């Protein structure tokens, strides 16, 4: 009955849409369609507070850079994501997403979210990354990045397994209720 | 529903000095309504940046969507915070407002602009999304 608006941003393919749908529909979306513009809604109760959360889904592809700012007005909390199986997605956090969000939305609380947590200890994933001299993002690296960009909090989740999904939105709601 | 008779009525009733810059750079005016083709018209509400609503007539043409405010017995092109209220159907996408069953989003994808429109009911909101979408798609 309290209304709040959440906007999710982050690199192409890092799991933003699957995270929203898993949360609001409790179903993992099977077919990947890259996002241009969508929006969803879910109710959540937190700390005895009942909140209707508007979920504004945005395009990770830079081809839609012009379009993303239409989603930022009136935002109460931002989920800024990277994928734990993609150290390059983490490095776009200070190089692209934070400067964009600080330009349009400078005083809006950010939850830094590492997605795809299921892949951290997945052997296939580690094996492929190692061929590239890469490793899955470690939780300390995510926490360090959260401090560097001044995020409200830091969470990790897997939409695929549902691990951590409820806690991400609990925290985002607490942040949305702040100020 | 007599579409051409309705369009003539809307033309005759809009104010000859009313104009609206489209996001392309093209200026739309009364005379530009003259030889358009009407798909549907009806009363709807636009949502301001401040969050408040204003009643308008939505006039969907085969190629454009137009919002008109009534002013002293005549139509004028609706004002909405510097946003263009004459909208090309090319590169336009339409979506439900998930948190408001009476609402729809129009996002013009030329810089782009988004406009939030509320029908008087969910059925009307659905009905409007349909016909806007059919017309975009030429069906
Ligand atoms: N293993 C695993 N895969 C996931 C997880 N979440 C999403 N994916 C997969 O990653 C791919 C992209 O996910 P998606 O949520 O659509 O990304 P997006 O960030 O929304 O992408 P875009 O719209 O900006 S291009 C899909 O193949 C999807 O199933 C996860 O938690 N674990
Ligand atoms: Mg997506």
Residue numbers in the entry:
A (entry chain F): 3 to 181
B (entry chain B): 2195 to 2304, 2307 to 2335
What does the report in the manuscript say about this coordinate set?
Value of the data• The Pleckstrin homology domains have long been associated with their binding to phospholipids. Although all PH domains from Lbc-RhoGEFs bind activated RhoA, the binding affinities vary greatly, ranging from an IC50 of 3 μM for PRG-PH, to over 150 μM for p115-PH. The overall structures of the two PH·RhoA complexes reported here are very similar; residues from the PH domains that interact with activated RhoA are well conserved among all Lbc-RhoGEFs.
The structure of RhoA·GTPγS bound to the PH domain of AKAP-LbcRhoGEF was determined at a resolution of 2.0 Å by molecular replacement using separate search models for a modified PRG-PH domain and RhoA. There are two complexes in the asymmetric unit. The final atomic model comprises residues 2195–2304 and 2307–2333 of the AKAP-Lbc-PH domain, and residues 3–181 of RhoA bound to GTPγS and Mg2+. The electron density is well defined for GTPγS and Mg2+ in the guanine nucleotide binding pocket of RhoA. Here again, the switch I and switch II regions of RhoA interacts directly with the β5, β6 and β7-strands of the PH domain from AKAP-Lbc. The structure of the PH domain from AKAP-Lbc shares a similar fold to other PH domains in the Lbc RhoGEF family. The two complexes in the asymmetric unit are held together by an interface formed between the α3 and α4 helices of RhoA, and the β-hairpin module near the N-terminal helix of AKAP-Lbc-PH that lies outside of the canonical core of the PH domain, and buries a surface area of about 330 A2. There is however no evidence that the complex of AKAP-Lbc-PH and RhoA forms a dimer based on size-exclusion chromatography. AKAP-Lbc-PH on the other hand, shows stronger binding towards RhoA·GTPγS, with an IC50 value of about 20 μM. A closer examination of the two structures reveals that the interface between p114-PH and activated RhoA buries less surface area (approximately 500 A2) than that between AKAP-Lbc-PH and RhoA (about 570 A2).
